[PDB]
């Protein structure tokens, strides 16, 4: 059986700028443990119906996972824009897979604010699909050089979410799993029952 429990039920989740990928291969995938659950706040599948996944075979499945805030979950979709899609985690326009999210306020908020989860606020260009950028270079926002320090129009590129359990839902932490279903000109290795 494919290890979707290790992905979905991981005690720790990545910051979105440093999003985690798990490759899933050579295993039997029971997707009903996902699509029969009422625990998810977002469950959207592109180019495939979840009620057909148990009948299908893929070359590889990738499971990407991270935390963002509630009102950013809509950015994890083909063709979307915004700080998360542009500078943190980008789906391809042709994406085939499922975007699954749930509220993680109980795990990822702290009284006084949890500042462990970061996102990238500034970048010279947009991420390509499935690109990851974990660099911490000072971002030049103006015309004067930064000399590697924060200062006049020179900003550290990562910002903390600061999740407090008392925030509005749009500002509460959401755990996200993106399942990519890949078809290469190569043998299928991940099949439903």
């Amino acid at each position, epitope marked *: 059986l494919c290890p979707f429990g290790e992905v979905f039920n991981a005690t720790r989740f990545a910051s979105v700028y440093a999003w985690n990928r798990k490759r899933i291969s050579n295993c039997v995938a029971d997707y009903s443990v996902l*699509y029969n659950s009422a625990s*998810f706040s977002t*469950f*959207k*599948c*592109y*180019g*495939v*119906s*979840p*009620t*057909k996944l148990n009948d299908l075979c893929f070359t590889n499945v990738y499971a990407d996972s991270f935390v963002i805030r509630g*009102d950013e979950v*809509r*950015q994890i*979709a*083909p*063709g*979307q*824009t*915004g*700080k998360i*899609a542009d500078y943190n985690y980008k789906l391809p*326009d*042709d*994406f*085939t897979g499922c975007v699954i999210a749930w509220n993680s306020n109980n795990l990822d908020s702290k009284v006084g604010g949890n500042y462990n989860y970061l996102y990238r606020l500034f970048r010279k260009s*947009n991420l390509k699909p499935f690109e990851r950028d974990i660099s911490t270079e000072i971002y030049q926002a103006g015309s004067t050089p930064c000399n590697g320090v924060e200062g006049f129009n020179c900003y550290f590129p990562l910002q903390s979410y600061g999740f407090q359990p008392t925030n509005g839902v749009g500002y509460q932490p959401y755990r996200v799993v993106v399942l990519s279903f890949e078809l290469l000109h190569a043998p299928a290795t991940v099949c439903g029952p």
Partner: antibody
Amino acid sequence: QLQLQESGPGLVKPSETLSLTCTVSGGSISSSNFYWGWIRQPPGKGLEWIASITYSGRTFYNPSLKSRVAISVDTSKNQFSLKLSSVTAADTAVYYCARTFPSYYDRSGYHYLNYGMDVWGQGTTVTVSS
Amino acid sequence: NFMLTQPHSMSESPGKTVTISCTRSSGSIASNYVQWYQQRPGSSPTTVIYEDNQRPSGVPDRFSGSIDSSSNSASLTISGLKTEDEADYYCQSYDSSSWVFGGGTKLTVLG
């Protein structure tokens, strides 16, 4: 970073065929996750949807215009097009091309597609005239 | 198909809240997603709300959308009104037959 650019003839004679083109940049017209459509706006009036298409060839039409409409895709030019036969004065409008929000299935396997416009073009003005 | 009815014209002061309605003449407003498009004079429409309540990136957070099954209407709420919000606003939905646009509301910012 998607940009859409209409091109049209400015003018068409009554009873002739209007042909418009939309050239896409910053995205591929062959994507299976999107529909591409046409919306028009007569002078001083509201919006009207004409038709939408996706590369696989599935098409949706405004039933009141359907019999006069053809819509098509040309992937090598990254274009989609509108044909409106037998035009009348009622067809004088600004015509917009647009890309829809992406199609998807929910957890129950319901399919949502071609439900609203995400990215709009610049508009091309069409005047029906002798 | 069904009609979406909007008020033709509304006026409000800067900093205040205005709510524009969009009433569906038959079938449940919740049966099908509602979008809202903003159009300034001489400009393309831009999408400010999709799937009833979702805001595109680049749309100020004082735009919100909601559905009232009680009046069978969708609403666009603009809080903290700015002079930049003066525009026509169109709601839009659909069913398996066709898309439907509201007739548009012209918003004027007073003062």
